[PDB]
Design a protein around this nucleic acid. Sequence first.
RNA 1: ACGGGGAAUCAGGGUUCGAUUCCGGAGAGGGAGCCUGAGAAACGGCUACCACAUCCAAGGAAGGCAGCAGGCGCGCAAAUUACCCACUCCCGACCCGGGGAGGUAGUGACGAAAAAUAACAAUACAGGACUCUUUCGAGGCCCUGUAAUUGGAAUGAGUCCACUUUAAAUCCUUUAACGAGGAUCCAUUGGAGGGCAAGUCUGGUGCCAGCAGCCGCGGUAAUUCCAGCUCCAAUAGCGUAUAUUAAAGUUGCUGCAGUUAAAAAGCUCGUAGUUGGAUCUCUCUCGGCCGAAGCGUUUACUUUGAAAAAAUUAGAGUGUUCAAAGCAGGCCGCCUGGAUACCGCAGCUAGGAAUAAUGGAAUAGGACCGCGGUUCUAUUUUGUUGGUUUUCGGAACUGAGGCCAUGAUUAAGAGGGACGGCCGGGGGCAUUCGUAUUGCGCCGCUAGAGGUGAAAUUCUUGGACCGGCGCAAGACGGACCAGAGCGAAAGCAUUUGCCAAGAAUGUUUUCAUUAAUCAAGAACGAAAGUCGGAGGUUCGAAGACGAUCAGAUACCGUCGUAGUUCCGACCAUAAACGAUGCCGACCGGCGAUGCGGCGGCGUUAUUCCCAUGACCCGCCGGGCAGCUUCCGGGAAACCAAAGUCUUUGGGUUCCGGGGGGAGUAUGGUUGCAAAGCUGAAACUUAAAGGAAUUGACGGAAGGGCACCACC
RNA 2: GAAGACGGUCGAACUUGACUAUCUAGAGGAAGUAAAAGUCGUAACAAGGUUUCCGUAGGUGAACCUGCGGAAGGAUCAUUA
Lengths: 149, 141, 129
Amino acid sequence: GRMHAPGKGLSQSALPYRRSVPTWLKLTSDDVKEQIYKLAKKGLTPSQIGVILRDSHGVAQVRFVTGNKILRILKSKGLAPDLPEDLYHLIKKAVAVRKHLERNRKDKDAKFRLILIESRIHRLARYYKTKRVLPPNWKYESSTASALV
Amino acid sequence: GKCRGLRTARKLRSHRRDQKWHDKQYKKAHLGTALKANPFGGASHAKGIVLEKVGVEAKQPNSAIRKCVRVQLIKNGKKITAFVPNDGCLNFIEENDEVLVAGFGRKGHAVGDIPGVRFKVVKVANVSLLALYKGKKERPR
Amino acid sequence: VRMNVLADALKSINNAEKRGKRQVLIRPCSKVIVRFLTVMMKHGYIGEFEIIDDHRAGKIVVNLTGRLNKCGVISPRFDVQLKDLEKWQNNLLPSRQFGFIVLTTSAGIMDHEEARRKHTGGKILGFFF
RNA sequence: ACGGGGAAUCAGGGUUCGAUUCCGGAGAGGGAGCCUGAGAAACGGCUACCACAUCCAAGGAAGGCAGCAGGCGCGCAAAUUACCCACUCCCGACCCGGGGAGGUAGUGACGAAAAAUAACAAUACAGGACUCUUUCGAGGCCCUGUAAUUGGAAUGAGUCCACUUUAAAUCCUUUAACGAGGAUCCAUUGGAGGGCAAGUCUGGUGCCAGCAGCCGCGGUAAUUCCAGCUCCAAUAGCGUAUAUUAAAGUUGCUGCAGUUAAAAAGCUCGUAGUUGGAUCUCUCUCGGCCGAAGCGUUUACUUUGAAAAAAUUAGAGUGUUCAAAGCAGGCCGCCUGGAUACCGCAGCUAGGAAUAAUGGAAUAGGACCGCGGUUCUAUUUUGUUGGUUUUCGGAACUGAGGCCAUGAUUAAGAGGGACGGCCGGGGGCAUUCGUAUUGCGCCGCUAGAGGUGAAAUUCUUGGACCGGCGCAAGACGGACCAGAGCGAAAGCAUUUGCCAAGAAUGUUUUCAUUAAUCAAGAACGAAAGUCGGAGGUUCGAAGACGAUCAGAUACCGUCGUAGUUCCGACCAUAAACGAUGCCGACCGGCGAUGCGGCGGCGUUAUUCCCAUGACCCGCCGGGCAGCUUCCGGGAAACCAAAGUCUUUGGGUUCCGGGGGGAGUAUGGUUGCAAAGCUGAAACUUAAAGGAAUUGACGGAAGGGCACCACC
RNA sequence: GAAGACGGUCGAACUUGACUAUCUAGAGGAAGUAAAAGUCGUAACAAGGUUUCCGUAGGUGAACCUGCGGAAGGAUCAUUA
């Protein structure tokens, strides 16, 4: 179930058994990489890049075509964000709820949700510091959270 | 449920050690408060001086007068009421003499219809109550 | 969360045998699960099984001969020496005539009789009878 | 609490104990300081002080039994002021001396071993035993025994002799002389209702005396007391009191329990702890199977091999007369034994690598190759030693290039995040509306309305109640409204707008173990209550009255204060309940319902070309529920979980141990206070309690009946 | 090379200051515990005669009563377009 909710959902993608490039894909690996670079230059996260490639151009999985994941490709050329995208979005949500709570001090549900969001941020940041994705002294603070977003 | 892990030995040991204090016998035998409250002080028997003879009424379901003696122990000076077991045996006991008194058989608990009595007289004047009862010995002059 | 996939596999097999079914679907599969099933099948308790290959973690469909009374896991996997094996068999097995304790030893995964034949102790995985 | 070896049951696991003869330590009344000596902070050495205490002629002197004996004291609790260096050893200048070490002993039931108190008739008997011919009849063929008529044989308990034994000796052993017929050479201790083996036999007692571990017995016919007889349990041994172990699966690791019996924290985050998804099968030297040399990524295992005192325990042998024991024992001088096992954990050593782990290349800052370019050179040479002999068993500055099949497992019916259309009484802020209630102002009367089944208070030619127009206040949000939804719980319902959040669904998106549960900490937490500031309609603790009552100052009625409302700050408690922790698997069926998605005949709505909304029939996922249960489980009530449990182990937190005392006292801690959290014990008790079954009862319902009922 | 305070050391002791936990003395106050129909007087168990109980506040001549919120362990698993 969810880490911070009582829900137990089964919604997630079901990757097909075949790991091959589809027959309809006339796009070679290098064109896919170039489109990935262009989409990243437009200011899009790897999730958005994958969504656009799956939706408009038609790419079942970038890994099955280019052999590398989108974030790995971005890091290889060097276009990746300094901090990971999921951590960045969690920090963004924390900043949003903290800004809301300033003018809504009576919103005691917002305070609880902010506590849950910051717990998620701390867990993810600890994991990233374990794998050296973040500097060992990387700390999240309320007064500095909007400085990272 | 209980924890089942290869490194849970400390948790299991500490939980057992903490839960043993919720055992009545364990707490009684290891806290040491029941030992200081015991008139015998951990001893099986004790010698005392008969202060007076008392008759305690039996508990409600049956009617009788239980021939006891109020004795004062020599070791600690504590006051004790001790049952004189057989019949006529209260006549073998005189006021202000030494008696050997043992427990009543329930480890500090009152026994039978006698209320609040957990001690019984074994010897009086250094001769057993049974020898006096059976006539094997007479009271010393 | 799901830890000890062997426990889930053995519980599913036991529950399907209690219900009287001829086949049970076990997922996820694992090397230890396959070895335990092979030890079971060499002794005639479980019969043939097939490993379905999905590209993440296999599933196994196990035919069920009605010969199995109970299959269980031992958690945690206690390290068992050859001198402590008899106590484990007395604790776990219905009798000295039938029933097996499955150990994992450096010589592989095998039952307690083979482990005594090869003069190896190991870690207890489970039992079946 | 000296530690250990070790000791008390054997299911397995454990729980207790170890002052005590072996090892180690410490101390010599308590401290302290020293001399001598190889060795002492020595005490059967010294010097002080402290506490006791001895002699004294009062000037002084002398002390240390937790050595052997003995005293006193303390106590429930423990022996002789004996003999000896003969043994075992120790000491010395020593073959010779000494040793209360040690050995040996008239009243040691601590405890352990062996083992007497009897073994054999004619006889009548209640008997039976191989085909018994007869209920009136062979029964030392086989056995039992009421026995005031029997009989011989056996023997040691005892008393004594011989000195075997021993350092003079007692003791066991040995030989002799006496030594048994109520073989009086006389077995006891506890019981006889049950548990628990064995008398509702007799006498006495009469809820007394007493018995009774517990249940119970005794109140003039006691199976239980006091006794007689008889019976039975163990037996030279039995009873009792305590501590302790098993019984106790009532401490549960094996292996308990937590809906209602005692019990899951009000709820949710969270660090430590515990647990954690799949996935990997001229490297090296004497002679064309050998020691060396191993960073294989250290480990955890598992299996070996050394090292782990003896005694004890297990165990091999060995007729102590048997046994407990001991380490010893024959053959007309020789053979032997004085074993072996185990000795946890932690250290040391050695195969194969299943299985917590640890993952060596990801800005490449990753083997192998040609360059020695200033340097150490088989610790520079290799005819009578001579500077300079650049790379072939090494060390730094690293300037170039190449086979690297060059190097990123997968993408969890794990988790996080993104995205999409939705969805919900979820939350905060602001803003609308609705009647109702209570006041107020006007417009119309009998002189009534209120309140309770007639028991009252409560205004009045100052007009109540009622009817109608408005006005103002606070409170609330009916019907719709559901075993429906949302939220972590508490909780959440008038419109609209803003703000941030959220589950589920959809996803061939992204990251790639980031996870589960959680000490410590933290957020929220009904109502009531507290402190300030507003407000104060209604209701209303307290209070004031009025009421049938024996008695309310209770229930009822009329008023009514704090409160009830809002804004800050506290409080942290509820039957905060599903009296049911959370995460994850598996295990039946069916019809619905909420949300999202997918599919499909048809029916309805926006110009006649389509989606889409409302229906209809289905499928999938999550959710609130409706279910037999002989899947299954429970004591059952009941529960598809309270199932997958003696066929007992998925992970983890909290937590209970008969009922009271008691959630009390005390300490701590929080709070302004009220109080909250943590939280005993002495003592007391044989039950308390849970589920259900029958009856009885109900100022409980349904249906009937009766002049011992009524009408 | 034989007695005795003194740059000193180890250091028992000894009075004086706080006034230290295992220990005891009095009329007390509050409470608990054992069977006792103890001088008009019933809270609970049945709808216990005001349904019970929880938390929290007051008040009481005692069980108790009342207000607010909650629970069914209720005396309703149900009440109709």
